[PDB]
Ligand binder design. Structure first.
Ligand SMILES: CCCCCCCCCCCCCCCCCC(=O)OC[C@H](COP(=O)([O-])OCC(O)COP(=O)([O-])OC[C@@H](COC(=O)CCCCCCCCCCCCCCCCC)OC(=O)CCCCCCCCCCCCCCCCC)OC(=O)CCCCCCCCCCCCCCCCC
Ligand SMILES: CCCCCCCCCCCCCCCCCC(=O)OC[C@H](COP(=O)([O-])OCC(O)COP(=O)([O-])OC[C@@H](COC(=O)CCCCCCCCCCCCCCCCC)OC(=O)CCCCCCCCCCCCCCCCC)OC(=O)CCCCCCCCCCCCCCCCC
Ligand SMILES: CCCCCCCCCCCCCCCCCC(=O)OC[C@H](COP(=O)([O-])OCC(O)COP(=O)([O-])OC[C@@H](COC(=O)CCCCCCCCCCCCCCCCC)OC(=O)CCCCCCCCCCCCCCCCC)OC(=O)CCCCCCCCCCCCCCCCC
Ligand SMILES: CCCCCCCCCCCCCCCCC[C@@H](O)O[C@H](CO[C@H](O)CCCCCCCCCCCCCCC)COP(=O)(O)OCC[N+](C)(C)C
Ligand SMILES: CCCCCCCC/C=C\CCCCCCCC(=O)OC[C@H](COP(=O)(O)OCCN)OC(=O)CCCCCCC/C=C\CCCCCCCC
Ligand SMILES: CCCCCCCC/C=C\CCCCCCCC(=O)OC[C@H](COP(=O)(O)OCCN)OC(=O)CCCCCCC/C=C\CCCCCCCC
Ligand SMILES: CCCCCCCC/C=C\CCCCCCCC(=O)O[C@H](COC(=O)CCCCCCC/C=C/CCCCCCCC)COP(=O)(O)OCCN
Lengths: 178, 128, 459, 603, 156
């Protein structure tokens, strides 16, 4: 989520992803903890037998019959964490997320309440106003010619500088605002 | 060996079952690299226009404008009368009308014949 | 009847002699006062009519339409106050003049004892609407939309003038009372068939009948908010009123003549309801929903039974109010976003809760939730069509289900989900917009308490 | 004078005061939920009196107080029917709603919009009371649509979640499919009987034809989620647990069965509609139990249990036993509401975790919920002398000794066995094994609201069956003499279900693993009905709506026919007419040609 | 702010205008593919894969997390058909054809069994129920001025 994606997945990453998926679905099949531990150790033993294989062709031929075997026995109703993209509470609290700029439209009678919070907000606004002008030139000078090759951003390198494009990452509403 | 999964239109093929991803060539890697390059350029432009404190409006999206324009206003100038278009238009615009006309005409002729013959038993039928 | 007409005429000098910063207030106040005067007309008798003079009469079919027409003008002024802020005083006065002239033409049209006067005013309404659409329109397709709107109507209504002059030459009168009392059957003849077509097509094209409805999406999408309000609320009902007035001389020819139009409307309600499911524009979706409702009204008028007529009147009033409210909500969104696309601004319930409540109530009323008058008309027409033929129930049910589907689709797409991140100019809703929605919605729920006021002369 | 009518109208009227005060100051404070709960409890204790009067005498009344409108010979007025069904169902519904609201005061404590949530619950209750006591078809339609709209609003409570909106729209779609048949029935009754009033319909229909009863059956199947229109009810679990406990468990979903009960005088005079009702109920109960047997979400399991119970209710309707179906409705209300309460308590105590694979030993860790759920499961399985006994046992006995289908009876018996089986599944996977929840234990029951709300329905699910069965007058001929094996058949199949389910569940401890079979995959994906019938029809309608209705016809061919053709022809004629070089040679040559023609063609 | 040349146009027939259209829609030329040049007015618009939006990556940081779209990316012609609120094309553990066969087979079997049960009912070894007064003639319909044919019941 936070990390920028790569142009492709290597063989090692794909093997790790299959290992994680197979372990999760085996846990879903084996409800009890001792049975899951036994079958997960057996799965690891079956999994690391071809660890030391060297040539690329047989390695690519493997993991493929493995994916087919996984798909045949994939437990059509796996366990999902409640906050996961398939969980029972994936986007439960997304209706309580209000943007930060909404506070700029509050009535002065409303802004009379919470004066310290709005003073701090104004300080943050000033900081952002200066930091953006620094960041535009910093990113212009740091970017390779012809456009970026990946969606990864550089950190700040000077003393008073802030990381480029930081305002909408730092000022996330919350995980559970209400 | 295990039973094979057969994809369909509404149940597509899984990504991990694509033989294409296993056929790796330098051209494929270069294509993926330039795909992510253009994606990163678009993301950079969007974030640059998004994090700007000066902007106080809607970021215009040319892709959305093109989508709406193609869906609504670009249809007729690209229309060409062909046997396919003519036949489909005639069917989908004339067939239902005549089908429903036949159905309702037959039903009403039957009802009128029964009324004239008097065997319909319309007792208590006051509001129409 | 002049106690309504004269103040509407005096609205013009009052507007043109007003101060540069007092046109809206005076126009709104006096329009509301005129509307109060119009309320007296609702009292109606079970007997013939309210025959004021040789020129004008009132009826329980014309009274609700007149009340709605008089009530709509203050709402149109309230809606137009916003986007005309940077306009010169003379042009704002011209806009108000166009609205007043349109109201006057509609008021004189709905009384209209004589049919040629009805035709003259029914055509006089065409000019102010055209000027409003093609002058104060935002896009460049407003010219083509106005051309479509003008030429469809004129091509439909030119044979009607010939039919009317022929009818007066033969019968000797076009006064509606004499026409009703001296009615004679039409023999099944080719000349009578073409006379029926010339009498019917002018009102069919303005309903709009399916297949002749092309002008409506263009005109509604390209018009300013006030133009869309009036077109959806009153101008569509002119065809229904004309058909109800003119089907008295078309008997018994109507029994078999109606089939082509009945089939077209019954299939076209399904077609337009399905079209509403795949639409990227709010205004186009609302326009196609209007087309479906008016097609069902066409079915009701063609069936020609007392329940059909009562349901058609109730549905006309309810649809006018609901479509006006929906267009106003869409305009409130547009004036913030300037896009007029459904998928751009999302999750507005989080930012604007009361406007989301207005959206929900408008969608529920369009969905024909009981005991709203929308469902009263819908159910009366459905029962009459079932008595006409038991097989209509399939099409009616399909239309109801698809209607609920796209109404809730429109509600969910715009009000629910996650807000668009890059849109940050969504200011709190003004008191003007909230009052506009309230004045749209409260009359509906008050009218559902006295449904006999909108059930027409056959109640 | 005759306090029956005054009290029955007073209950419904006082149920609406908090709705009027929703714009007052109390709505902006944190005392609003307690206010609404107190109002509901007062309404229940007030409505307990007309039921007592009916129990003493049998009082029956019709109240047509306000006359709304009259169309010709048809008169429509606000009329309330206060018969056995109304005066018996109102106290039960009010009791369940009071318990659920006291539970919600605890469950929804951290939700910012709780006053709104409480207000919505009150709105739903008001609509359901309108539905139950309606005397004509228009008022009952008003309630029919009101409960559906409240269901739509409460399912999509978390409107930021896409799946909640999808489930709400699904419920609306299926309910509209039922509304089609409802409207058909209304049209038929108005056309033929000249009334929507129930009394006139009962007089003028001695041999009711097939069409109105088929429309009523379609509406009942739509709202009670029968096999054709079932999937919306399990998807309605997206909403908060109190919503699933009140609406989609015991009060709203019995509306179709109640509609078929209300029209029972016409139902008994038709034999084909009764057959269709029986077959629909049997297939629904079997299919829903088979779906339930293998689910992992507890709420999904209990929802499929509710659907199977509704199928059994409609089987009872099909065998011409309406009062028994009403009694089963009343009993199922109690025990299914308590089952959802226990499930919600478990879910809250485990950090909003619903899957049963991640809940282990809760028999000792939280015992009050354990005993309440055990009693509810026993009640659900028709344990002798328990709330479920006095309805389910009679259902089985009546189906066993009636001239009905053999297949329907077999399906009902298998459904009873599967009911025992998934009750065993719930208990085994939720209370018996070793704990499987995350290490940070936050288990807590010590809250008076939850305990009191659960224990009230516990006392109900223990004693209400006996009390109600012994207090109501007889309404059907009893099955006095029976074969001994036919008398024990319900108990035999239920005990077989316990034993087989327990034996098959005990094998999960063994250290062996095998891939699933085809039957398990069929049962787990709910017979693949949701996948096929939510991907094929929707796609085919939307694709047509875009390609043919929208583009091909409207934007292309209708545009080609009148306007484009007219423009093209007029432009071509204009080009032909105006393309003149300005040479008087050709002009006067044409004049000469024209002059000659006039002389020789017009005379 | 969008210019005239940035709007969709007619079907491309030359490779140069094919590349121009591919550049306009912000994609590679090798990845660009228009709809077939049939009568329908697709014109110059990419024929994106018919994959649904539900099966896009839920972990990528989309500019529109709900719709799972990125700003500036080409939009599928049928986007409003696949919005995670409508028809989706996510692969299923069981194949479409097998699912159809199993679902259809179960329904056909249930219907045929119900018909068989109609043909072969179930009942008890008893005679018809007996009602005293001429099969309750007066209380069922009435008609007291016809004197129906009396029916009398057999005591055993
Ligand atoms: C109002 C509410 C709702 C209403 C819904 C609206 C619907 C109304 C619109 C309906 C429009 C459908 C008909 C359109 C006209 C067809 C011709 C045309 O459009 O010209 C373009 C086009 C002329 O272009 P072209 O340069 O000559 O050739 C281009 C083709 O690619 C070259 O093609 P080809 O050379 O291969 O053609 C050979 C062959 C085509 O061979 C076939 O396979 C089709 C034969 C079947 O053609 C034939 O043999 C003719 C038969 O004509 C065609 O290409 C196709 C013509 C054949 C289509 C058959 C017509 C459909 C039948 C409809 C009749 C039903 C009602 C008619 C009412 C008449 C009495 C009032
Ligand atoms: C059921 C009896 C009720 C008696 C109490 C009297 C209630 C007076 C209401 C007057 C009309 C409402 C005006 C519409 C705009 C609402 C204004 C507003 O913004 O509220 C802000 C205000 C302050 O809240 P806030 O926190 O500042 O605002 C935050 C957001 O707005 C967030 O606010 P929210 O989340 O709370 O939502 C706003 C709320 C309010 O918005 C609405 O949607 C309410 C309008 C629903 C009707 C939709 C059209 C369907 C056709 C119905 C036409 C019948 C009308 C009858 C005559 C009406 C006379 C004007 O929406 C809802 O709660 C969901 C409504 C769905 C209900 C579906 C059931 C309808 C059919 C039931 C049958 C009715 C007749 C019974 C016949 C048989 C028995 C005799 O909240 C309220 O006061 C809510 C209004 C009360 C709820 C009304 C629900 C039923 C009443 C319908 C009309 C009266 C029936 C007469 C029978 C009496 C016996
Ligand atoms: C008249 C004499 C009266 C006395 C009768 C005799 C007394 C009883 C005799 C016993 C008879 C069988 C009872 C055992 C039930 C089976 C249990 C079992 O072995 O399951 C494991 C086994 C596979 O499990 P697995 O793959 O390893 O799952 C992995 C873990 O176990 C995953 O485990 P998990 O933890 O995820 O969940 C566990 C769950 C998961 O287990 C399952 O997967 C459930 C699937 C099997 C249960 C379904 C049985 C209900 C039958 C209704 C079918 C109606 C017809 C449908 C037609 C379909 C049309 C295609 O299992 C359970 O919870 C318990 C299952 C039910 C046992 C408790 C109740 C059984 C008693 C009621 C049945 C009969 C008594 C009626 C009482 C009234 C007296 C007449 O399931 C099977 O192999 C199915 C066995 C029978 C299925 C027959 C249907 C085959 C149809 C194929 C096509 C045929 C041609 C059609 C042509 C059509 C042309 C149009
Ligand atoms: C395009 C989008 C929709 C626009 C609106 C469309 C609605 C207009 C359709 C007009 C309705 C029908 C017109 C005439 C109906 C009369 C019934 C007649 O047609 O049926 C038979 C008539 O037979 C034949 O049809 C003769 C007419 C054949 C010539 C007509 C052309 C057919 C297709 C034309 C459609 C074009 C419509 C659009 C024009 C631009 C009956 O046989 P017959 O007993 O002898 O005649 C009875 C009448 N009598 C008693 C007066 C003699
Ligand atoms: C409140 C506090 C004030 C207390 C003092 C008043 C005490 C009661 C005295 C009231 C006087 C009696 C009265 O109300 O007059 C009757 C009068 C009816 O008018 P009538 O002309 O007599 O007949 C109707 C057709 N014309 O009754 C009333 O209006 C009062 C009660 C009406 C019933 C309640 C209505 C609530 C529902 C609103 C309508 C819902 C939509 C319609 C549903 C259609 C269902 C088929
Ligand atoms: C007649 C019905 C005709 C079909 C209507 C088509 C409507 C198309 C437009 C709907 C909009 C698209 C849509 O709703 O999306 C599908 C939506 C989302 O899918 P989910 O399963 O919820 O997955 C979400 C989790 N990922 O699912 C739906 O709601 C689709 C529901 C379609 C139901 C169609 C099947 C109905 C057939 C009824 C047959 C039985 C007849 C009744 C028998 C009664 C006997 C007395
Ligand atoms: C949206 C566009 C729709 C445009 C309107 C389409 C229909 C137009 C109606 C037909 C046009 C002529 C109307 C007839 C005027 C009424 C006069 C009348 O009825 O008298 C008839 C006159 O009848 C006619 O003359 C009709 C001749 C038709 C000529 C004009 C043809 C115009 C197009 C006709 C076909 C299309 C009509 C339907 C269009 C469908 C919608 C597009 C009898 O005349 P007499 O000789 O005095 O009496 C006979 C005994 N001696």
């Amino acid at each position: 989520a936070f990390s920028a994606p790569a142009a492709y997945l290597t063989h090692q990453q794909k093997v790790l992803r299959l290992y994680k998926r197979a372990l999760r679905h085996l846990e879903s099949w084996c409800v009890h903890r001792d049975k899951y531990r036994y079958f997960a150790c057996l799965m690891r033993a079956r999994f690391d037998e071809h660890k030391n294989e060297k040539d690329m062709v047989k390695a690519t031929q493997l993991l493929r019959q493995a994916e087919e075997e996984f798909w045949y026995g994939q437990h059509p109703q796996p366990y999902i964490f409640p906050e996961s993209p398939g969980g029972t509470s994936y986007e439960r609290y997304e209706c309580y997320k209000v943007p930060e700029w909404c506070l700029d439209d509050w009535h002065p009678s409303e802004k009379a309440m919470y004066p310290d919070y709005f003073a701090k907000r104004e300080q943050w606004k000033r900081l952002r106003r200066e930091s953006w002008e620094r960041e535009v030139k910093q990113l212009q000078e740091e970017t390779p010619p012809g456009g970026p090759r990946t969606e990864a951003l550089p950190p700040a390198r000077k003393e008073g500088d802030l990381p480029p494009l930081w305002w909408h990452i730092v000022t996330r509403p919350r995980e559970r605002p209400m | 060996s295990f039973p094979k999964y057969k994809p369909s239109r509404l149940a597509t093929l899984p990504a991990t079952l694509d033989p294409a991803e296993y056929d790796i060539s330098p051209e494929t890697r270069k294509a993926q690299a330039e795909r992510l390059a253009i994606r990163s350029r678009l993301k950079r432009e969007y974030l640059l226009q998004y994090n700007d404190p000066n902007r106080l409006g809607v970021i215009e999206d040319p892709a959305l404008i093109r989508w709406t324009y193609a869906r609504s206003a670009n249809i007729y100038p690209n229309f060409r009368p062909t046997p396919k278009t003519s036949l489909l238009g005639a069917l989908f615009g004339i067939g239902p009308l005549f089908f429903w006309y036949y159905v309702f005409k037959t039903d009403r002729d039957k009802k009128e014949k029964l009324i004239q013959e008097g065997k319909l038993d319309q007792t208590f039928n006051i509001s129409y | 009847m002049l106690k309504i007409i004269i103040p509407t005429t005096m609205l013009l000098p009052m507007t043109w002699m007003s101060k540069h910063n007092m046109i809206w207030i005076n126009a709104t106040v006096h329009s509301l006062l005129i509307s109060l005067i119009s309320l007296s007309l609702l009292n109606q008798l079970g007997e013939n009519s309210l025959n004021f003079s040789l020129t004008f009469f009132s009826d329980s079919l014309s009274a609700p339409l007149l009340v709605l027409t008089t009530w709509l003008l203050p709402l149109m002024l309230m809606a137009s106050q916003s986007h005309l802020s940077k306009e010169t005083t003379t042009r704002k006065k011209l806009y108000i003049t166009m609205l007043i002239l349109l109201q006057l033409f509609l008021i004189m049209t709905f009384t209209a004892t004589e049919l040629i006067l009805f035709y003259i005013l029914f055509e006089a309404t065409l000019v102010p609407t055209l000027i409003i659409i093609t002058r104060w329109g935002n896009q460049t397709e407003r010219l083509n939309a106005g051309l479509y709107f003008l030429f469809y109507t004129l091509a439909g209504s030119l044979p009607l003038l010939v039919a009317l002059v022929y009818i007066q030459n033969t019968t000797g009168s076009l006064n509606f009372l004499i026409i009703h009392y001296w009615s004679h059957p039409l023999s099944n003849s080719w000349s009578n068939i073409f006379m029926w077509l010339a009498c019917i097509m002018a009102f069919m094209v303005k309903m709009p009948l399916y297949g002749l409805h092309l002008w409506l999406p263009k005109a509604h999408v390209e018009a300013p908010i006030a133009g869309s309000m009036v077109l959806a609320a009153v101008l569509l009902k002119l065809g229904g009123y004309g058909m109800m007035r003119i089907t008295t001389i078309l008997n018994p020819l109507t029994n078999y003549m109606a089939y082509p139009f009945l089939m077209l409307s019954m299939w076209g309600m399904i077609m337009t309801s399905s079209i509403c499911l795949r639409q990227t524009d709010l205004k186009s979706l609302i326009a196609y929903s209007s087309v479906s409702h008016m097609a069902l009204v066409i079915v009701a008028i063609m069936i020609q039974t007392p329940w059909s007529f009562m349901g058609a009147t109730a549905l006309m009033i309810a649809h006018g109010l609901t479509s006006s409210m929906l267009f106003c909500l869409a305009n409130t969104n547009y004036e913030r976003v300037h896009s007029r696309t459904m998928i751009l601004a999302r999750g507005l319930q989080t930012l604007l809760p009361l406007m989301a409540t207005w959206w929900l109530v408008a969608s529920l009323t369009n969905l024909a939730l009981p005991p709203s008058i929308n469902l009263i008309g819908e159910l009366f027409i459905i029962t009459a069509s079932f008595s006409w033929s038991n097989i209509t129930i399939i099409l009616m049910g399909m239309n109801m289900m698809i209607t609920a589907l796209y109404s809730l689709y429109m509600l969910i797409t715009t009000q629910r989900g996650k807000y668009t991140h890059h849109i940050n100019n969504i200011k709190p809703s003004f008191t003007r917009e909230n009052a506009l929605m309230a004045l749209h919605i409260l009359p509906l729920l008050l009218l559902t308490l006295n449904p006999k006021m909108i059930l027409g002369p056959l109640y | 004078m005759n306090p029956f009518a005054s009290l029955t109208l007073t209950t419904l009227t006082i149920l609406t005061i908090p709705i009027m005060m929703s714009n007052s100051n109390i709505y902006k404070t944190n005392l609003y939920p307690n206010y609404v709960k107190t109002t509901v409890s007062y309404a229940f204790t007030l409505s307990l009196v007309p039921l007592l009067m009916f129990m003493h005498t049998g009082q029956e009344m019709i109240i047509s107080n306000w006359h709304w409108m009259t169309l010709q010979t048809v008169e429509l007025s606000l009329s309330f029917k206060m018969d056995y069904f109304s005066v018996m169902f109102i106290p039960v519904a009010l009791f369940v709603t009071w318990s659920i609201m006291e539970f919600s005061m605890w469950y929804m404590h951290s939700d910012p919009f709780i006053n709104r949530f409480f207000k919505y619950l009150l709105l739903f209750l008001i609509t359901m009371m309108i539905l139950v006591t309606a005397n004509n078809l228009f008022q009952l339609f008003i309630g029919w649509e009101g409960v559906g709209i409240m269901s739509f609003l409460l399912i999509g409570w978390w409107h930021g979640r896409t799946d909640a909106n999808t489930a709400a729209l699904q419920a609306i779609l299926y309910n509209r499919i039922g509304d089609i048949g409802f409207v058909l029935s209304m049209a038929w009754f108005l056309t033929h009987s000249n009334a929507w009033d129930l009394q006139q319909i009962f007089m003028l229909n001695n041999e009711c034809p097939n069409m109105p009863l088929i429309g009523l059956l379609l509406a009942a199947a739509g709202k009670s989620a029968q096999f054709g229109l079932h999937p919306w009810l399990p998807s309605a679990m997206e909403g908060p647990t109190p919503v699933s406990a009140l609406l989609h468990s015991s009060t709203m979903v019995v509306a179709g069965v109640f509609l078929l009960i209300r029209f029972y005088p016409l139902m008994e005079t038709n034999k084909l509609v009764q057959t269709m009702t029986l077959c629909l109920g049997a297939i629904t109960t079997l299919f829903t139990a088979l779906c339930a047997i293998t689910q992992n979400d507890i709420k999904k399991i209990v929802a499929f249990s509710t659907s199977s119970q509704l199928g059994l209710m409609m089987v009872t309707i099909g065998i011409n036993q309406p009062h028994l179906a009403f009694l089963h409705i009343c009993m199922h209300a109690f025990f299914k509401a308590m089952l959802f309460m226990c499930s919600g308590s478990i879910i809250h105590s485990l950090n909003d975790e619903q899957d049963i694979r991640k809940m282990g030993g809760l028999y000792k860790a939280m015992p009050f919920t354990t005993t309440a759920l055990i009693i509810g499961s026993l009640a659900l399985t028709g344990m002798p002398y328990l709330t479920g006994f006095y309805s389910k046992d009679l259902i089985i006995e009546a189906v066993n000794m009636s001239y009905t289908n053999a297949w329907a009876l077999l399906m009902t018996l298998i459904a009873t066995s599967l009911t025992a089986a998934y009750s065993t599944r719930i208990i085994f996977f939720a209370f018996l094994g070793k704990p499987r929840f995350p290490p940070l234990v936050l288990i807590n029951e010590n809250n008076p609201l939850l305990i009191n709300s659960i224990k009230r329905l516990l006392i109900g699910s223990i004693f209400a069956g006996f009390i109600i069965s012994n207090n109501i007058p007889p309404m059907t001929v009893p099955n006095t003499t029976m074969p001994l094996y036919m008398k024990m058949t319900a108990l035999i199949v239920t005990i077989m279900g316990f034993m087989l389910a327990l034996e098959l569940n005990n094998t999960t401890y063994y250290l062996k693993f095998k891939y699933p079979s085809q039957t398990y995959k069929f049962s787990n994906m709910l017979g693949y009905y949701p996948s096929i019938m939510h991907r094929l029809p929707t796609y085919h309608n939307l694709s047509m709506s875009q390609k043919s209705a929208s583009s091909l016809l409207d934007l292309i061919w209708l545009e080609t026919i009148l306007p484009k053709t007219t423009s093209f022809i007029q432009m071509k004629m204009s080009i032909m007419v105006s393309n003149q070089k300005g040479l008087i040679k050709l002009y006067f040559l044409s004049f000469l040609i024209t002059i000659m023609i006039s002389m020789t063609l017009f005379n | 702010h969008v210019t005239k040349d940035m709007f969709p146009g007619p079907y491309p027939k030359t490779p140069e205008e094919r590349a121009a259209a591919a550049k306009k829609y912000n994609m590679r030329v090798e990845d660009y593919e228009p709809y077939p040049d049939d009568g329908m007015g697709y014109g110059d618009y990419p024929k994106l894969p018919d994959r649904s939006q539900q099966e896009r990556d839920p972990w990528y940081d989309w500019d529109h997390p709900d719709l799972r779209l990125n700003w500036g990316e080409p939009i599928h012609w049928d986007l409003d058909m696949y919005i995670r609120n409508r028809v989706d094309t996510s692969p299923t553990p069981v194949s479409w054809n097998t699912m159809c066969k199993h679902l259809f087979g179960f329904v056909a079997f249930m219907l045929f069994m119900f018909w068989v049960g109609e043909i072969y009912p179930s009942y008890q070894p008893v005679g018809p129920k007996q009602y005293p007064y001429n099969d309750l003639y007066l209380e069922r319909g009435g008609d007291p001025t016809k004197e129906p044919e009396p029916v009398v019941h057999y005591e055993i």
